[PDB]
Design a protein around this ligand. Structure first.
Ligand code: LUV
Ligand code: LUV
Ligand code: LUV
Ligand code: LUV
Lengths: 120, 118, 118, 120
């Protein structure tokens, strides 16, 4: 299932609990960027996915403020969980920083992360 | 600041409460798509933003399942709150549906919404 | 239709000619970023679009090198032309810079531009 | 170099010539979607990349009309070429379909493609 400890291709660690009714709650530790230690994450997932072999839609957010650092930014990941012998969460993400209105055009990075349960 | 009722350019409704710990909680009603009634949202925001004229970074997620409908999809909005009179939240979003592996290339829509506080 | 001079909400300038074969060619001048003067653009559009009220799909690219400056980056705009009086091109864009492998995660910005025909 | 025949992770074929002054010109055959045979592509790349080990920025567009089909849509790929023993083009893409104004919110798919010169 979705609940567990996941790692992306950068070595970031995503520890999450999937609640029965659709909540995602956990912590995220980024291997890159202006970040140290764990950050709070929350999100949602489809708690009754289709029964046709499709993945399970989900998303979550981290605001990059914790007890140690504040990067004045937030990332959201949107994607799907694909179960099986080697489960995956395939995502695309948007990282928005707080900017002035004049710099808003350069506020948001986009990328993609693949998560597996394999510890690097 | 963030706490309140917001609408976007499609006529969708966002009711949110921003907690002291950086939490966002509330409900979302979409004017479009495979959606009816309110859906749970959850997210996070920068609870100690810069005071140099920058927006406040925030994001949230809605999974499009409630007790009335399930679209097997989820949207995340990533953006920033711009306060003052005429408060706005400017976002870009990703909407992913659950797909088979063969259809995964067409799983995700992208767009942008502007929210106005009422 | 598409052929002409366009501006966006940032004050950038897009001069384009749409060819019978689906080609777009022209020049772009950005109001923002690491850019000065005109840059070559090239792209494609649907030269036989639907006539049922749909926009006309199109995209183009600018690499941010000209004979005056090089920002080691490139933007692509993907969107659709909506004709008539008050013609518009509504787009979303991806701006990728050349990076080292360690910095690749932060290579690409995303945004949206609306162009108005003059 | 960039000039050559590339394949993505779906098995699509990207045949391109990189002109000396920044042009990309070629053809694209998609393994998926409403597509058959080759489609014209054009784009641009940085014809004088940095000399610090960075990739080469580039982008290109395909409108999905050819002699056989018209899907009333266009894809742009934005990314970078990374040379070496196993050269790659790493991209993110936007696929916009012509829609009514009311359906514009659902006009654009986003994804990512990785290209290599290895024929599947
Ligand atoms: O670095 C972070 C937090 C960690 C992000 C980690 C990302 S989440 C998507 C991806 N997946 C993963 O596991 N890790 C990465 N936030 C960006 C904060 N922005 C700046 O510091 C900044 C930047 C910038 C932007 C992106 C990446 C690196 C640097 C550039 C210019 C200005 C700023 C800036 C300055 C003042 C206030 C706010 C932002
Ligand atoms: O419609 C929704 C839920 C509501 C989204 C509203 C969006 S959120 C971003 C934006 N902002 C806002 O306020 N409203 C919109 N989700 C997409 C569900 N997808 C499908 O049913 C689907 C579609 C499709 C695409 C767009 C709109 C409607 C339907 C196309 C092909 C296949 C599917 C599909 C089939 C089976 C299972 C899952 C998806
Ligand atoms: O500024 C440009 C060229 C002009 C883009 C204009 C954009 S196109 C989408 C939008 N629409 C429009 O009309 N104008 C804007 N390219 C980015 C170059 N990147 C860097 O120099 C860079 C940056 C950065 C990010 C945003 C703006 C300015 C600079 C941040 C970190 C590192 C780099 C960097 C360093 C070395 C080599 C390449 C990139
Ligand atoms: O399928 C294509 C062309 C081929 C795209 C291949 C993509 S390019 C990004 C990726 N990389 C790659 O190598 N292959 C894929 N265009 C989409 C045309 N849209 C529709 O037919 C359509 C769809 C839809 C959207 C995306 C994918 C599949 C289907 C859904 C609803 C309505 C339409 C539609 C109807 C009438 C007119 C236009 C669009």
């Amino acid at each position: 299932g979705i609940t567990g400890t996941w790692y992306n291709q950068l070595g970031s660690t995503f520890i999450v609990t999937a609640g029965a009714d659709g909540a995602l709650t956990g912590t995220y530790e980024s291997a890159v960027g202006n970040a140290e230690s764990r950050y709070v994450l929350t999100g949602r997932y489809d708690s009754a996915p289709a029964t046709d072999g499709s993945g399970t839609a989900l998303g979550w957010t981290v605001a990059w403020k914790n007890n140690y650092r504040n990067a004045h930014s937030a990332t959201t990941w949107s994607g799907q969980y694909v179960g099986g012998a080697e489960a995956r969460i395939n995502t695309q993400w948007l990282l928005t920083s707080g900017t002035t209105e004049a710099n808003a055009w350069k506020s948001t990075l986009v990328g993609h992360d693949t998560f597996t349960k394999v510890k690097p």
